[PDB]
Design a protein around this ligand. Structure first.
Ligand SMILES: CCCCCCCCCCCCCCCCCC(=O)OC[C@H](COP(=O)(O)OCCN)OC(=O)CCCCCCCCCCCCCCCCC
Ligand SMILES: CCCCCCCCCCCCCCCCCC(=O)OC[C@H](COP(=O)(O)OCCN)OC(=O)CCCCCCCCCCCCCCCCC
Ligand SMILES: NC(=O)C1=CN([C@@H]2O[C@H](COP(=O)(O)OP(=O)(O)OC[C@H]3O[C@@H](n4cnc5c(N)ncnc54)[C@H](OP(=O)(O)O)[C@@H]3O)[C@@H](O)[C@H]2O)C=CC1
Ligand SMILES: CCCCCCCCCCCC(=O)OC[C@H](COP(=O)(O)OCC[N+](C)(C)C)OC(=O)CCCCCCCCCCC
Ligand SMILES: CCCCCCCCCCCC(=O)OC[C@H](COP(=O)(O)OCC[N+](C)(C)C)OC(=O)CCCCCCCCCCC
Ligand SMILES: CCCCCCCCCCCC(=O)OC[C@H](COP(=O)(O)OCC[N+](C)(C)C)OC(=O)CCCCCCCCCCC
Ligand SMILES: CCCCCCCCCCCC(=O)OC[C@H](COP(=O)(O)OCC[N+](C)(C)C)OC(=O)CCCCCCCCCCC
Ligand SMILES: CCCCCCCCCCCC(=O)OC[C@H](COP(=O)(O)OCC[N+](C)(C)C)OC(=O)CCCCCCCCCCC
Ligand SMILES: CCCCCCCCCCCC(=O)OC[C@H](COP(=O)(O)OCC[N+](C)(C)C)OC(=O)CCCCCCCCCCC
Ligand SMILES: CCCCCCCCCCCC(=O)OC[C@H](COP(=O)(O)OCC[N+](C)(C)C)OC(=O)CCCCCCCCCCC
Ligand code: SF4
Ligand code: SF4
Ligand code: SF4
Lengths: 368, 175, 451, 56, 161, 353
């Protein structure tokens, strides 16, 4: 956020351009930069595009969904946000997105596969194509966002493709490409917290045992802003994670009390809060819905990843290398699960869980 | 984990129909688009003198009801938000809350200079300089006020864009 | 007022006055012992309670519960725009009304000081935006009075002709929207076509259906086009039937009278004290009209009658506004038959623009045209309070001149602003559907109220 | 709309009268001397979202 | 499969877990509906319709009183119960549904023999009215008297004046 | 195939009869929504829907399909029980009331000696389903509308029930078909013209139609009980309300205008004499003819529902309570004593035959 995201009013890109900034940093100001955010209509793109457009950075947002892009225009002043209809199977549209940008941010990536795109097409084929198209267009900075457990030799088809995608981005764009490895991100409408906030979660006895180091999505969006506007971060890999380690079983049980579903001794068990299932059934059901359901459900690869915990690459850089302190999930967990609290609505008295109260609740959850 | 992606596949808005399912989801899209265009239910949100011209569209001379256009009091029954009047700082949170309560799909029409960019009250301490600082806007109708025909033309532009929707073929060909 | 022991923000301990004797009871005993011998265990014995709940002074701590508070907010068909009317109801009975305004406050008075007198005129088109030309007239009259000028004879008649066309345009909006809010949908549709015919006259003289910056200090911007009066007279020959058909559905209807008779009664004393004017004042028995009290712009050269009520409720004001419909049509016919020839604007190029043909041949015309549009005209220092009989009521402007080409201060007195300030006094006791009737009988356009 | 003479020459002499009158300040004009020597504008913008369509 | 058994099984489950007063006014309607349907399909269609005509009007008046007396108390309160104790209770209850212990009366099926002597053939409601308005007319006139007392009784209780 | 195909149609024939019965009622309900706007439009000197389908014939289809393609608004996916139970109870109630409507002699799905009671009993359930929307809801406009629904129910229920009982008393039967056939020599509009007005006034109050639209008063309670309803729950309530308008219009034609009986006995015989009674085509034409007589009479009262909406303003519900309890009830209970006295005086007590 801040009031002006730059250390100076003059910035010479590594491509040779000199970009001046005007204004004090409001909506009417400009930074002189043109950025392209691939995957801007997604969960993280809306955070990133909003932070760039609010300070006057011209953002090119290539879209495939016409309805999802409309809310992005509100973030910036007139002419700041620009849309290009595109497809990763179309090369002319990809070049048009990066033709004028000085920064290219790649947020395109899926944990699923569909009738049209496999995990290899998106996490590798798209990332490689975008990196090469960026280089031929003279883009000074490339930022590629992989996952937290990226590994070219992983048993998970998502972790493997994310790890290989890191390699191909550097092999095309060159050694100066920056790589970000966010942990599971929590925010409003967060894919990480949405599965924990769902009631009828089938096979949670297997799925919810994975441990992670969740990180605030606003900080990940803030960190990417720091990286793009500081050329000392080129060629670097950043592992953005929170200080504390949680298992999805803990958060699932901590959320239950905040939602007050446990007010009744019978209701959570009757409503389907716990849905134990043998892993072969979880495999078959995930496999079956992969060719019957039209919406991306819990697939086979996510079942495998439920066993693999998050491993922090120690050779990579952290939030402290960017001069930022990670946020604590304890200080943000309530306000992001607040919409899901059942009665609330100033009935008698709200139970606002402070940061101290969340940690007290965590011990009670872990007490048998 | 190798991959091979095509390079010359056109975008959704320019992609021709090749197989049977391209026609099937196009037919599925057209019927839903036809209904939403035909049942054009704006929300009663007349703020200022731009509302008078919006009331004259429902008047017998123009009679929007003949096109299937019915004004709804509740945001739940509405899919179009027509901002007809000046949006003040005191009203902006209420306007955003009212917009957020519309079930999807929802469109917003900005009518008149006040809603477009502030208009006569652009340099006022208590006026929002354009409703598109608070909500996404799909079409902008100019005038102070826009005539009833100018508003009807703006609606016809939105109905034209609604008839080009490809939501179900987007699932088939882009997802 | 002050947090006391028995009454505070969160609870009160209410005790009524004791009607009965203060009977003294001492030496309470049972057949096994005195009261003090078992009073330790008497907490479990309901038959041993010495305090009776029927006693007027029985202590009860009752939490202060908010009464049913309803936001009759901006998103509501009853509110004629943006009005956050906050009602505290007892079921549906109104107990207290808190009209919250400023949702359409746009700082018109602040912006006017930054504009020249000519530039500030279109701001008046947007205060009462159904009675547009009357708003321009009150500003024009105030500036002309400060300028010590007067409109020529034909100009005054034109402002009277479109003063009453505008009045009809306002009452079509007011009477029929009020009827529609009660539930009579059909009269709204009929009369809005009459608005279309009238706004055609607006567009032909100025080029805008609604915001016609046509009445300006010194006269009118442009003369009447050829053939306009014949169209106005042709419209007038049929408009009597339109009013009669509207009265067929409302005037003698038992349902309409049940919704308006005895609703929103206003005494002649309370009408004056709260500053009500126009139909709100006249419905209470006071025969006062600004067109008669302080005549202006050829209203002295026409004949019309004022309808005065006797019961001061919604039905009386409906009849009065229907009479004014016919009295305006009476004035419109006279103006069409009495329109004189001559200039429409003041013959002074230091205030009014010269003709284009003269501007491009005469050097002095070109100088005045250049100076009028780049500096405006200076107005002698002073102040004025000029009122007109606007269709809503008494609309007035308090203009302060500093001798320059910009107004130092411009306070616009809005008739609807005063009417809405008496709503809580009027609507108390009535039910929630009656608030809809009271709102519609005040003729509230909130651009005028907030400006 | 800006207008031309029948010969194709622009009517506007960049006199900036309309800029001063404009009640909404929706007109922005920048002028200089043309290469041929005529008093012509090179910048004439109207903000249609700010104009009140008032005819001044 | 007699599906009325399942309906009463669900109703008994919801009566044990009901918390607020709105759920109770729904247990009433969830009780009259199985009664009306079973009377309609087995014993008396006349009294299935009389139940609907009279009880519904009583239900809405009952519902409107809930609005005027709802007092925030049981929305935020907590109950404990336990899913296991609920289902075990309903299982033990379901075990014994023999309201009568005459096994022959409950097991042996019977029939009636029709006769053609009743050539004047009219509905049960016409015979009920024929007796009620002639032989038990006193019962009808006392019922009219009791209905009058309720009218006076309701006024002297509720009316402040 | 052949034989198996032919007698499978016999196995499914009555289901198609019901599907055709359901289809026929939904067509009238769908195009009543179009007809109301066309009728109001020309009375208001506009056109009404003529741009959705050829001359506006697809306007009803577009409204349903658009609303069926809208997101349903609810706090959670499992909270369907809240805002769907109410609409279903209201819809099931009015649809079940159509089981006793005869389109011809014996052409009712349900025929019984207590069809009148079933008709009144079934519609009373729909009143309950409406109030369920304000189920401890936080929407104050839904809550305010639930109070008014109960107040209107108390107003009309006694009058509407007693009026139908007087008609049943004149024929001494509670079978709807017997009441229709009892009007061969006289239509009950002539002897009971006051009761026809009272029945229609009660029908307007029952259906929450103007001038008694105090429940869904847009200018007062934005949308009443529907202010929080969107997409499918809104269609079902809207569909059931217009189904009730068709039902009460058809009941006005049954109780006072002879039901399906022909306007002219001479013309009815002339038209039917063209077709051989030994051919199935005679019974098609007769079914069209008899239902046409019912359709014509019901169309006029469906027109009258729209007609009163376009002419009269709304009346406050507290005035409606006084009107029903101080005016309509004393008049109707006078006729319930008047009518048996007249018949006994002239030795004309009715019997079933
Ligand atoms: C057209 C179908 C209409 C009904 C469909 C909805 C099915 C829900 C249950 C219907 C009746 C079954 C028996 C329920 C009796 C009332 C008990 C009750 O409180 O309602 C159950 C409902 C569920 O709430 P739940 O979250 O599960 O429990 C509370 C957790 N603290 O808690 C609620 O308050 C929601 C109730 C909504 C309003 C229902 C009004 C009653 C309608 C009954 C009509 C049918 C008669 C019963 C037939 C089935 C008999 C078992
Ligand atoms: C459908 C659910 C039916 C549930 C049921 O058990 O119905 C029993 C039904 C009895 O057979 P039925 O076809 O009704 O008798 C015809 C004799 N002429 O037997 C059946 O289940 C047949 C139901 C098949 C017909 C379904 C609707 C056909 C029309 C669709 C158009
Ligand atoms: N907890 C988290 O969210 C984590 C995120 N990540 C990675 O961060 C990145 C941001 O993802 P996030 O915003 O959180 O959630 P999303 O699932 O919405 O990210 C996917 C984005 O990339 C686009 N996308 C996916 N496939 C395609 C495709 N074939 N063609 C075009 N666009 C495609 C999507 O476009 P559209 O919106 O139109 O569908 C969307 O914008 C992802 O790459 C993710 O792998 C890794 C670790 C944690
Ligand atoms: C009733 C018919 C519904 C079938 C849905 C379906 O077949 O869809 C399912 C699949 C998958 O494709 P997807 O939805 O893009 O995969 C994304 C969703 N996952 C992650 C759950 C797999 O589709 C196909 O096999 C394509 C052919 C379908 C053509 C239409 C039939
Ligand atoms: C009852 C349901 C009726 C549905 C009617 C809508 C059909 C529609 O929308 O038809 C539009 C579509 C196609 O679009 P097109 O305009 O031909 O453009 C396509 C351009 N080609 C022809 C070059 C590819 O036609 C159909 O494939 C009609 C098939 C369904 C019959
Ligand atoms: C089953 C559930 C209930 C039924 C629901 C029915 C809803 C109505 C359907 C929507 C109407 C619609 O879509 O027609 C409107 C559309 C919109 O055309 P456009 O978008 O302007 O482009 C089209 C024009 N071009 C491409 C030149 C720009 O016309 C069409 O393209 C119609 C063309 C195809 C006609 C094929 C007819 C085949 C026979 C069908 C009958 C036996
Ligand atoms: C009901 C039967 C009459 C159909 C009306 C019609 O065919 O309507 C014409 C349709 C709808 O297009 P529209 O723009 O609403 O037509 C209105 C014309 N106006 C604007 C002048 C009023 O056009 C088409 O042929 C396109 C769709 C292909 C044919 C499928 C129609 C839907 C079938 C579902 C019902 C059978
Ligand atoms: C009141 C106006 C309707 C009216 O007067 O309707 C009643 C009258 C007279 O019919 P009727 O004597 O009641 O017997 C009905 C006799 N048919 C069966 C020949 C109709 O119908 C008409 O003349 C039509
Ligand atoms: C014995 C022969 C019985 C006659 C049968 C008919 C009985 C009708 C009774 C009406 C009495 C009345 O209108 O009552 C008026 C009451 C209360 O009015 P109030 O406050 O007392 O003022 C009036 C008292 N005055 C005038 C003496 C001072 O409310 C109403 O406005 C009710 C309006 C009902 C309109 C419904 C529209 C129906 C349209 C029908 C198209 C087919
Ligand atoms: C012969 C036909 C005409 C007879 C009329 C006699 C009127 C007597 C009257 O009205 O009696 C007068 C009294 C008291 O008058 P009040 O209004 O209380 O005050 C008097 C007036 N003040 C205020 C000036 C003092 O009223 C009553 O007890 C009314 C009882 C009527 C109940 C009717 C219920 C409906 C039943 C209809 C059949 C089913
Ligand atoms: S744009 Fe003009 S007509 Fe519209 S609300 Fe603003 S001032 Fe009034
Ligand atoms: S500056 Fe404006 S007023 Fe002057 S000549 Fe050009 S267009 Fe005309
Ligand atoms: S019409 Fe528009 S551009 Fe011209 S002076 Fe008026 S506000 Fe300015």
């Amino acid at each position: 956020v801040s009031t002006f995201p730059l250390k100076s009013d003059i910035n010479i890109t590594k491509s040779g351009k000199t970009l001046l900034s005007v204004g004090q940093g409001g909506r009417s100001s400009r930074t002189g930069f043109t950025a392209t955010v691939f995957g801007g209509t997604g969960f993280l793109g809306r955070v990133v595009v909003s932070k760039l457009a609010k300070h006057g950075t011209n953002v090119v947002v290539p879209f495939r969904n016409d309805r999802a892009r409309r809310q992005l225009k509100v973030n910036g002043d007139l002419g700041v946000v620009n849309f290009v209809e595109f497809d990763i199977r179309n090369l002319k549209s990809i070049e048009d997105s990066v033709k004028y940008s000085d920064i290219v941010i790649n947020l395109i990536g899926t944990e699923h596969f569909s009738k049209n795109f496999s995990i290899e097409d998106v996490n590798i084929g798209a990332a490689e194509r975008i990196a090469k198209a960026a280089k031929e267009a003279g883009v000074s900075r490339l930022i590629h966002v992989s996952s937290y457990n990226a590994n070219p030799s992983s048993s998970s088809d998502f972790y493997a493709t994310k790890g290989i995608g890191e390699q191909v981005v550097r092999d095309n764009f060159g050694p100066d490409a920056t790589i970000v490895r966010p942990a599971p991100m929590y925010f409003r409408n967060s894919p990480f917290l949405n599965e924990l906030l769902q009631i009828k979660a089938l096979g949670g006895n297997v799925i919810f045992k994975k441990e992670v180091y969740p990180v605030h999505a606003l900080q990940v969006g803030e960190a990417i802003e720091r990286i793009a506007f500081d050329d000392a971060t080129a060629g670097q890999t950043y592992e953005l994670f929170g200080k504390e380690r949680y298992s999805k079983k803990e958060l699932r049980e901590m959320i239950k009390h905040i939602i007050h579903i446990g007010q009744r001794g019978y209701y959570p068990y009757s409503a389907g809060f716990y849905l134990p299932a043998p892993e072969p059934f979880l495999y078959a059901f995930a496999l079956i819905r992969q060719y019957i359901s039209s919406q991306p459900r819990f697939n086979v690869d996510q079942l495998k990843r439920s066993h693999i915990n998050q491993e922090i690459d120690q050779s990579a850089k952290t939030f402290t290398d960017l001069g930022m302190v990670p946020d604590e999930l304890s200080e943000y967990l309530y306000r992001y699960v607040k919409p899901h609290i059942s009665y609330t609505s100033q009935t008698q008295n709200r139970t606002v869980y402070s940061k101290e109260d969340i940690e007290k609740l965590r011990d009670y959850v872990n007490t048998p | 984990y190798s991959s091979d992606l095509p390079t010359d596949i056109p975008v959704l808005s320019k992609r021709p129909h090749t197989n049977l399912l391209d026609y099937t989801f196009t037919t599925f899209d057209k019927m839903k688009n036809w209904a939403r265009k035909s049942s054009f239910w704006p929300m009663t949100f007349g703020l200022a003198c731009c509302a008078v011209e919006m009331m004259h569209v429902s008047a017998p001379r123009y009679d929007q009801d003949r096109l299937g256009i019915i004004f709804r009091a509740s945001p739940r029954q509405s899919d179009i938000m027509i901002v007809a009047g000046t949006v003040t700082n005191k009203m902006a949170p209420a306007l955003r809350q009212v917009y957020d309560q519309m079930p999807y799909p929802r469109w917003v029409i900005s009518m008149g200079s006040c809603a477009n960019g502030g208009g006569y009250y652009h340099y006022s301490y208590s006026v929002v300089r354009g409703v598109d600082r608070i909500v996404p806007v799909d079409i902008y109708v100019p005038g102070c006020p826009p005539t009833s025909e100018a508003l009807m033309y703006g609606v016809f532009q939105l109905q034209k864009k609604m008839m080009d929707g490809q939501t179900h073929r987007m699932w088939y060909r882009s997802y | 007022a002050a947090q006391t022991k028995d009454n505070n923000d969160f609870y009160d301990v209410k005790t009524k006055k004791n009607d009965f004797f203060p009977v003294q009871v001492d030496g309470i005993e049972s057949s096994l012992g005195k009261y003090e011998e078992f009073a330790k265990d008497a907490h479990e014995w309901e038959s041993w309670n010495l305090q009776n709940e029927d006693h007027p002074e029985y202590p009860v701590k009752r939490t202060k519960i908010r009464h049913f508070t309803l936001n009759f907010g901006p998103q509501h068909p009853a509110a004629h725009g943006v009005l956050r009317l906050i009602l505290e109801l007892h079921g549906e009975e109104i107990l207290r009304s808190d009209p919250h305004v400023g949702l359409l406050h746009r700082g018109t008075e602040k912006l006017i000081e930054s504009k020249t007198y000519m530039q500030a005129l279109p701001y008046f088109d947007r205060l009462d935006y159904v009675s547009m030309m009357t708003n321009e007239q009150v500003f024009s009259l105030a500036v002309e009075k400060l300028l010590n000028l007067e409109v020529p004879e034909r100009g005054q008649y034109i402002r009277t002709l479109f003063g009453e066309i505008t009045r009809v345009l306002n009452h079509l909006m007011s009477v029929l929207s009020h009827a529609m809010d009660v539930g009579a949908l059909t009269p709204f549709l009929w009369g809005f076509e009459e608005r279309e015919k009238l706004m055609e006259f607006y567009e032909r003289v100025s080029g805008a259906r609604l915001h016609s910056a046509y009445v300006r200090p010194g006269g009118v911007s442009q003369d009447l086009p050829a053939g306009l009066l014949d169209d106005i007279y042709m419209w007038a020959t049929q408009f009597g039937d339109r009013l009669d058909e509207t009265e067929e559905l409302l005037t003698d209807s038992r349902i309409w009278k049940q919704r308006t008779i005895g609703i929103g009664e206003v005494t002649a004393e309370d009408a004056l004290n709260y500053g009500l004017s126009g139909v709100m004042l006249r419905g209470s028995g006071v025969p006062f009209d600004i067109r008669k009290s302080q005549p202006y712009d050829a209203y002295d050269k026409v004949d019309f009658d004022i309808a005065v009520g006797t019961k001061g409720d919604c039905y009386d004001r409906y009849l009065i506004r229907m009479t004014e419909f016919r009295q305006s049509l009476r004035i419109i016919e006279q103006c069409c038959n009495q329109m004189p020839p001559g200039p429409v604007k003041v013959e002074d190029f230091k205030v009014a623009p010269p003709p284009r043909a003269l501007m491009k041949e005469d050097m002095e015309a070109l100088i005045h045209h250049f100076l009028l549009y780049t500096k405006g005209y200076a107005v002698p220092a002073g102040e004025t309070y000029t009122a007109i009989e606007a269709p809503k009521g008494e609309m007035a402007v308090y203009v302060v001149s500093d001798g320059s080409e910009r107004p130092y201060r411009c306070k616009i007195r809005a008739p609807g602003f005063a009417h809405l300030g008496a709503f809580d006094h009027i609507a108390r006791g009535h039910f929630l559907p009656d608030a809809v009737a009271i709102i519609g009988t005040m003729d509230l356009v909130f651009g005028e109220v907030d400006r | 709309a800006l207008r031309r003479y029948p010969s194709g020459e622009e009517r506007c002499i960049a006199c900036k009268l309309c800029e001063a009158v404009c009640p909404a300040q929706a007109i922005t004009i920048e002028a200089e001397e043309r290469i041929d020597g005529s008093r012509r504008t090179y910048k004439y913008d109207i903000d249609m979202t700010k104009c009140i369509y008032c005819g001044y | 499969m007699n599906l009325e058994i399942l309906d009463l099984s669900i109703l008994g489950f919801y009566s044990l877990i009901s918390s607020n007063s709105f759920e109770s006014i729904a247990i009433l309607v969830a009780t009259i509906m199985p009664v009306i349907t079973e009377l309609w399909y087995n014993y008396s269609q006349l009294f299935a319709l009389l139940y609907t005509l009279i009880y519904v009007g009583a239900v809405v008046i009952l519902f409107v009183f809930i609005l005027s007396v709802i007092n925030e108390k049981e929305e935020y309160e907590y109950e404990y119960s336990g899913l296991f104790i609920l289902i075990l209770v309903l299982l033990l209850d379901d075990l014994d549904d023999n309201e009568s212990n005459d096994n022959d009366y409950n097991n042996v099926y019977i029939t009636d023999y029709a006769d053609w002597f009743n050539n004047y053939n009219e509905s049960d409601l016409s015979v009920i009215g024929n007796l009620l308005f002639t032989e038990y007319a006193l019962l009808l006139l006392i019922i009219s008297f009791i209905l009058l007392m309720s009218i006076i009784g309701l006024i002297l209780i509720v009316k402040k004046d | 195939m052949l034989n198996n195909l032919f007698d499978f149609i016999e196995y499914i024939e009555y289901w198609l009869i019901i599907v055709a019965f359901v289809a026929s009622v939904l067509i009238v309900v769908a195009y009543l929504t179009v007809a109301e706007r066309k009728t109001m439009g020309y009375m208001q000197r506009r056109l009404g829907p003529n741009a959705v389908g050829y001359y506006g014939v697809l306007m009803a289809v577009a409204d349903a399909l658009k609303l069926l393609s809208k997101e349903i608004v609810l706090p959670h996916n499992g909270d369907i029980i809240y805002v769907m139970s109410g609409p279903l109870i209201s819809l099931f109630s009015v649809l079940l009331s159509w089981a006793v409507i005869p389109f011809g002699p014996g052409l009712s799905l349900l025929d019984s000696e207590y069809s009148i009671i079933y008709l009144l009993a079934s519609g009373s359930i729909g009143v309950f389903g409406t109030v369920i929307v304000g189920w401890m809801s936080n929407s104050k406009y839904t809550v305010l509308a639930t109070v008014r629904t109960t107040a209107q129910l108390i107003s009309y229920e006694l009058v509407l029930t007693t009026v139908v009982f007087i008609i049943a008393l004149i024929v001494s039967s509670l079978n709807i078909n017997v009441i229709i056939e009892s009007q061969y020599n006289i239509w009950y509009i002539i002897p009971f013209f006051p009761l026809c007005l009272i029945f229609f006034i009660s029908a307007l109050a029952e259906t929450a139609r103007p001038p008694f639209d105090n429940v869904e008063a847009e200018s007062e309670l934005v949308s009443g009980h529907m202010t929080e309803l969107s997409a499918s729950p809104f269609v079902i309530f809207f569909l059931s309300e217009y189904c009730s308008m068709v039902l009460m219009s058809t009941l006005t034609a049954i109780f006072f205008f002879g039901g399906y009986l022909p306007f002219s006995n001479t013309i009815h015989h002339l038209i039917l004499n063209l077709f051989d009674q030994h051919s199935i085509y005679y019974f098609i034409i007769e079914g069209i003819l008899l239902s046409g007589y019912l359709a014509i009479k019901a169309n006029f009262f469906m027109f009258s529902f729209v007609w009163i909406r376009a002419a009269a303003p709304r009346l406050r519900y507290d005035l409606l309570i006084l009107f029903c309890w101080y005016v309509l009830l004393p008049i109707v209970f006078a006729i319930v004593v008047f009518a048996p006295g007249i018949l006994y005086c002239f030795d004309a007590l009715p019997v079933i035959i």
